């Protein structure tokens, strides 16, 4: 796996959407650049998962499960309604949700990067590399 290394170093929750920075380091000449980053929303991860599941050539392969939709409704309701004690627990709550959802999204990508077949998939490469919003693409 050392030729393709993916991590999510930061993320942003705004209104009802969560954007993740997806950072790639690779030694593969099947990517344009050895290190790059893109912004991806949760929906884009769901699209990538579905696309793989629907690729008939991959039937039988172990496709890692999609990350679940992050849930910031509770924290966001506290934030709006809302002292230093109460504000500290709010940040802790946000932080706990972020650590979990960043982990699930990152693990999905890391599992794809390790798979000898799925790591080569064109849609996976687009997901990592394409330096525009994928939502409009699809």
């Amino acid at each position: 796996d050392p030729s393709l290394q993916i991590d999510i170093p930061d993320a942003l929750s705004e209104r009802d959407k969560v954007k993740f920075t997806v950072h790639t380091k690779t030694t593969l000449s099947t990517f344009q650049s050895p290190e790059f980053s893109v912004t991806r929303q949760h929906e884009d991860f769901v699209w990538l998962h579905d696309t793989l599941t629907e690729t008939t050539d991959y039937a039988g392969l172990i496709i890692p499960p999609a990350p679940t939709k992050p849930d910031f409704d509770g924290p966001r309701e506290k934030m709006q309604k809302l002292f230093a004690k109460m504000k500290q627990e709010l940040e802790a709550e946000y932080l706990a949700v972020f650590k979990k959802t960043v982990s699930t999204h990152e693990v999905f990508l890391q599992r794809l990067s390790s798979h000898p077949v799925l790591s080569k998939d064109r849609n996976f490469h687009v997901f990592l590399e394409y330096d525009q919003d994928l939502s409009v693409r699809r």
Partner: peptide
């Protein structure tokens, strides 16, 4: 309106959250 930004601390640092807007 409101937005909250997360930074992973990774190996050495610890994680941070910042209220934006």
């Amino acid at each position: 309106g409101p937005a909250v930004q997360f930074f992973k601390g990774k190996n050495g640092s610890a994680d941070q959250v910042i209220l934006v807007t």
